[PDB]
């Protein structure tokens, strides 16, 4: 359903300054396509998406321990809203 | 690697009990059980006191100092106490508490 | 593979010299012992509905007498 899909928001210095222009970034399910991703944001936040762009992201670490490591694997969706922007209070952060 | 399996992940006592240290240093010494680890066969009694050197870096103030704290034991303390000295366990019953088996001896109080 | 009774199974080809005579020359020494196969033939016959199945010779005979489950 709605409330799943968008796992976490994108932290970073670039997402916070993208916020300041009504552009929101989220880490979503890598299988959750643009239309499904559009709907999920639209409902859960009560706002219309005028544009959506997204892209899949790889992993790969280890600090020590001969455990060669392994990936993590994401998808990052970035949306723009019509003139009356903002999302909750989780935008001013 | 093995460990605390030799017994049966079964302690011969509870974390409430008063127990006497049978064997080692701290002989006969009595104390309230504060931590019982059945699998590891560990007991924390107000008896074995040690000074633990506190390796403290930037971890909320430097103050790298020494600490007074209790160091856990095995089966080197006997299964509860009543006639003042160390004991075993035998005569099971149930008072107003039917859903409980008690532990007795060459007497009958725990 | 004859529809009625499967076939093609076969064995070796011995070929001796000092070959045939008065019961005993010296004897009959072998010079061969290989490994060979043997087969049959085919035609078009049916039962129930339409079929064109492979038919043996001693199957074409067994049919040009009394029909067994499948006709002509």
């Amino acid at each position: 359903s709605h409330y799943d899909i968008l796992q976490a928001p994108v932290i970073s210095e670039k997402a916070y300054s993208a916020m300041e222009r009504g552009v929101y970034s989220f880490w979503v399910s890598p299988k959750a396509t643009k239309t499904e991703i559009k709907d999920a944001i639209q409902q859960a936040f009560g706002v219309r998406v005028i544009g959506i762009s997204t892209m899949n992201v790889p992993g790969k670490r280890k600090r020590v321990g001969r455990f060669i490591g392994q990936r993590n694997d994401r998808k990052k969706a970035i949306v723009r809203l019509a003139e009356g922007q903002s999302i909750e209070a989780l935008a001013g952060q | 690697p093995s460990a605390g399996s030799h017994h049966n992940d079964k302690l011969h006592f509870k974390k409430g009990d008063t127990v006497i240290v049978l064997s080692g240093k701290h002989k006969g010494q009595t104390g309230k059980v504060l931590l019982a680890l059945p699998r590891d066969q560990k007991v924390v009694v107000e008896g074995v006191n040690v000074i633990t050197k506190n390796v403290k870096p930037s971890m909320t103030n430097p103050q790298g100092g020494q600490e007074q704290r209790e160091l856990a034991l095995h089966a080197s303390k006997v299964a509860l106490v009543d006639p003042e000295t160390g004991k075993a366990t035998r005569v099971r019953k149930q008072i107003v508490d039917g859903k409980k088996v008690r532990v007795a001896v060459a007497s009958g109080k725990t | 593979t004859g529809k009625k009774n499967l076939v093609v199974n076969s064995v070796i080809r011995r070929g001796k010299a000092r070959a045939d005579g008065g019961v005993g020359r010296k004897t009959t020494g072998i010079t061969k012992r290989v490994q060979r196969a043997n087969l049959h033939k085919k035609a078009i016959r049916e039962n129930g509905q339409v079929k064109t199945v492979w038919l043996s010779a001693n199957a074409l005979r067994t049919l040009s007498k009394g029909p067994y489950k499948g006709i002509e």
Binding site: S1, D4, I11 | - | -
Partner: protein
Amino acid sequence: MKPSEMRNLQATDFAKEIDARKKELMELRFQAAAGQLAQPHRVRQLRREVAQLNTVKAELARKGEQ
């Protein structure tokens, strides 16, 4: 939470209870991302809660329609 006081609810009153937790679970997921999870136990609790609703909605589906 767990006994008979859970099965009284109707049809959409079961899908409702799930949705309210999934939403809370997501608010906590976002809270985790912005270093604000003081109560991590709340996370498993709701996951145990949603599981219970989903388990029961299957018990009652067979304790009627057989």
